[PDB]
Ligand binder design. Structure first.
Ligand SMILES: NC(=O)c1ccc[n+]([C@@H]2O[C@H](COP(=O)([O-])OP(=O)(O)OC[C@H]3O[C@@H](n4cnc5c(N)ncnc54)[C@H](O)[C@@H]3O)[C@@H](O)[C@H]2O)c1
Ligand SMILES: NC(=O)c1ccc[n+]([C@@H]2O[C@H](COP(=O)([O-])OP(=O)(O)OC[C@H]3O[C@@H](n4cnc5c(N)ncnc54)[C@H](O)[C@@H]3O)[C@@H](O)[C@H]2O)c1
Ligand SMILES: NC(=O)c1ccc[n+]([C@@H]2O[C@H](COP(=O)([O-])OP(=O)(O)OC[C@H]3O[C@@H](n4cnc5c(N)ncnc54)[C@H](O)[C@@H]3O)[C@@H](O)[C@H]2O)c1
Ligand SMILES: NC(=O)c1ccc[n+]([C@@H]2O[C@H](COP(=O)([O-])OP(=O)(O)OC[C@H]3O[C@@H](n4cnc5c(N)ncnc54)[C@H](O)[C@@H]3O)[C@@H](O)[C@H]2O)c1
Lengths: 267, 267, 267, 267
């Protein structure tokens, strides 16, 4: 019940991690506005959280649809405390040599407009409200914003670019608006890619994830609730939380190094 | 109450951030065991929190002291869920040039034994318990573990060394024990030093903290509660949470970049 | 002469750092092909360096232009050993708030196509050659790829995005092609911007550069020579060389910390 | 021939990487002073480089032996341009659960005194000369200063601590002395450990090193020559070069991702 009386705006929140955030935020007593391209999923989200959540049909690439979202949130809930730019697009982990010449330009535009420009526009549109509420921006990043092999050249670059947005916007919006970033990873997603283009579980636990399990979307919502809590994260700005099961602390031969511990410590 | 039923062991928790963490963890429904060398201040928290806080007097540099703290935590509460190695000493930001040639060796030992060895000895002492509970470690680092001018060569090195403890212990203790770091910064505590040695934050704020204010000790507890909440931080291990008012994302001329922002929007 | 027999392709090398790199690489015994949109300045270096430098006029945003540069390099010199994507555009450090709502979309495309896509298209065009020679890529990043206030949201994001290109391309092109980044900082160049938009470094030095001086363009070439020397940088891939006069290690009050050091030692 | 007329002091340079640096530096026309505990190897080094190199028998843990080294270098060569604190001790990659209780204290003291305090004392002793020569410090670090599994809790912490020394000393010694760090890895070493304590090639190339080979000590010397070159690294201070074959950019399942490239690009 950390988010009583708090109002969030979450982009791309009609499915996947975005939807999980909505469901959790509403359950934490928050009021949530969602900008997404999916009309029928937005209405589905609205009836699932009657009164607490409102959906606005639009494109995150459009600044005017971002403004419509910010305007609709203010109209319905009076304020915007926390902004979660979350809408993202994958590149099917396509390598540079595997990107066809005749498709490489449009693929760049698509992935960068949704992944970076969408985040730029979202903060731009909600800025007046966030300065008024003295709130915070929590960007959804990725392990592909810190490490390779979590996407091709396109997705990795877009996700490293939002890390730059975390740092720059934290500087720019201070002392009024705090800007932080969560970088999730090792999820179970129905994440899609551009129209221009087109790891086994056993290998994922032994070599990719030290934690030795692939958590559900619900387990990735806690990080956002923390950043959106009124009195829990005031000192936090420019913060980067790697939330990927330990992809950056994985070992050379095996992901984890303490699987023997229980029977080594005689428990 | 978010930590109901949980048990924490915090070192250096009789004053400053540590005490604030004790207060907050008890208030959140958890039970806290505290290792500190200050006898008077351990009694102070004992009467304050009743049976929910046990104070064990000892030095963090001593392993058998650390083990005695782990014993008492198990005897009083039955388990250990979250270990918070927090006990730390400062070097007054004494430069290498200002370090006396006869005081340097003893000052190196003093600061590294508490700041790094005491962090090692705590995990070592609590390892069988934390493995049993599938619990987690949360190190108190500092801005001095990431950027210079937080302390001198000694303090900076020690706080950088615990960053190494975060990464190595996150690998070594996986999959059962998650290991994370919080790095507080804008604090204003009576952080003491070595008896082998001899500018206020407020006087320099607009060059240090983009957040534009000085957060209370209480405001730094939320990050630890997060890493202590099992249903909120499961996919987090090896994570480094910069919690320093944005010291690492400050500007060149001034710390914050948007002093004249509310007038650009007419708020 | 350290680069005798080697062949380099540098983009944006008709002025500033790029030209300095051309000058230095030719002086070190190598032969340089240059891609730039400035026709006059490409002629200027052609007469200066004789047959050892070929200028190809084109846009880095265009892949077939990039391929035409790779063709001409092979036609003139027979191979490509070191590719230096360097062509870059600035945003005048224009804040998100100061970005017009009608100029933002076109400014995003302008800056990201040159700064990120032009870096992608260069490697893509030169990949068959660099794989053939077991050569290496060296990206020109910036302090804005690591810390804020180097540019606005756009430039910072782009320069952070190339950091992602370093990491992903270092993985994708291994074991045959090493991929590294240099990040210059204390430069003083006529770094232009997008035609969709409208404080000197010297005026702010003691807050910016710990080195206490402004290095000439020539002084920034040595890092690239290093990554271009096969017998000197073989174990280097994915390396990020901060080359910014120490912007990331500056103090809070002043950039440098030992102004009064020679008197503490009586020098 | 980059180092003509340059004078270096390198600690622990009687064997391994240190010795390789001496041999290379002398071959680059540099004059080298070496502080090491091995008397017979120092004299062996001296006769191998007659006139250009001078050896001083002492302990890096001793500040007075560091002062003797700095004094002997000045006496023989008149100046100290570059200091390379290189003397280090491994921990046989011993995990925390594998460190015996009765040995953990002395092991900490030994590894931290050589690895961190030695570096502290070296800079301390050469400081007067380095301010006079306006030179630079180049610390030898390790991949274990950035990533886990390159050592146990002890070695990883010591190597992360020197990264802190790079950042702090770069701040402290500016604008006169530049402070940088090289972090080598994937070497072929006879590196030893403490008396308290006590990866196959195929697995090392497929999972550990993207470059797909284990280079000789000679290939790791180039990075140091760059930092010690008079006019090649003036803008460089606080710089961290990961020089480990790409350990930090390695993939999830395989170290490299472009082994198919040659026959994919039809060469
Ligand atoms: N796949 C993974 O495991 C993984 C790893 C790291 C990071 N992430 C990040 O998680 C975040 C959310 O992922 P998800 O699982 O919800 O993906 P998803 O595809 O399930 O959901 C994405 C949502 O964004 C909306 N959307 C996409 N483009 C839009 C546009 N242009 N305008 C408006 N709406 C748009 C879609 O309608 C969809 O509802 C993304 O930013 C992704 O980069 C995922
Ligand atoms: N002071 C700041 O602004 C600041 C900034 C960043 C990080 N920190 C970190 O905060 C952490 C908590 O300390 P604090 O800031 O509250 O300072 P503090 O001095 O108020 O608290 C330190 C506690 O550690 C205990 N302690 C010290 N040495 C001990 C030993 N050898 N054995 C047992 N107990 C010992 C002390 O009794 C005290 O209760 C420290 O690790 C410090 O590095 C402080
Ligand atoms: N200005 C600074 O102080 C500073 C600081 C850090 C990093 N940098 C980086 O240095 C790099 C080199 O640029 P510079 O500083 O010499 O500035 P510059 O403007 O002098 O050089 C840029 C060159 O790129 C060429 N160019 C620009 N757009 C092009 C295009 N679309 N197609 C082909 N060529 C194009 C220009 O003709 C010019 O010759 C840039 O990537 C910049 O981001 C500069
Ligand atoms: N093993 C690897 O592949 C690896 C990986 C990363 C980093 N490194 C680093 O490389 C550096 C050099 O390694 P190396 O191969 O030369 O090791 P080495 O054991 O071959 O050489 C170390 C030298 O240091 C000297 N020395 C040690 N302790 C001393 C003391 N207290 N006083 C004086 N001299 C002392 C020894 O006499 C020896 O000559 C070390 O700092 C090590 O941490 C090695």
């Amino acid at each position: 019940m950390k988010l009583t009386g708090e109002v969030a705006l979450i982009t791309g929140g009609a499915s996947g991690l975005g939807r999980a955030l909505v469901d959790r935020f509403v359950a934490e007593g928050a009021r949530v506005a969602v900008l997404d391209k999916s009309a029928e999923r937005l209405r589905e989200l609205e009836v699932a959280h009657g009164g607490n959540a409102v959906g606005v049909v639009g494109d995150v690439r459009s600044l005017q649809d971002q403004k419509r979202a910010a305007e609709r949130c203010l109209a319905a809930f009076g304020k915007i405390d926390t902004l979660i730019p979350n809408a993202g697009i994958w590149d099917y982990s396509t390598a540079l040599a595997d990107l066809p010449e005749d498709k490489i330009d449009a693929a760049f535009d698509d992935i960068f407009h949704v992944n970076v420009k969408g985040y730029i526009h979202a903060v731009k549109a909600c800025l007046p409200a966030l300065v008024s509420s003295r709130g915070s921006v929590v960007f959804t990043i990725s392990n592909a914003g810190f490490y390779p092999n979590g996407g091709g050249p396109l997705y990795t670059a877009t996700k490293h670019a939002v890390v730059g947005l975390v740092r720059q916007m934290a500087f720019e919006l201070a002392p009024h608006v705090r800007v932080n970033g969560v970088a999730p990873g090792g999820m179970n997603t129905d994440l899609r890619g551009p129209s221009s283009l087109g790891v086994p579980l056993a290998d994922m636990l032994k070599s990719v994830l030290p934690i030795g399990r692939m958590p559900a979307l619900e387990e990735y919502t806690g990080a956002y609730v923390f950043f959106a809590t009124r009195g829990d994260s005031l000192p936090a700005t420019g913060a980067l939380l790697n939330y990927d099961g330990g992809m950056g602390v994985r070992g050379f031969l095996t992901a984890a190094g303490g699987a023997d511990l229980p029977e080594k410590l005689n428990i």
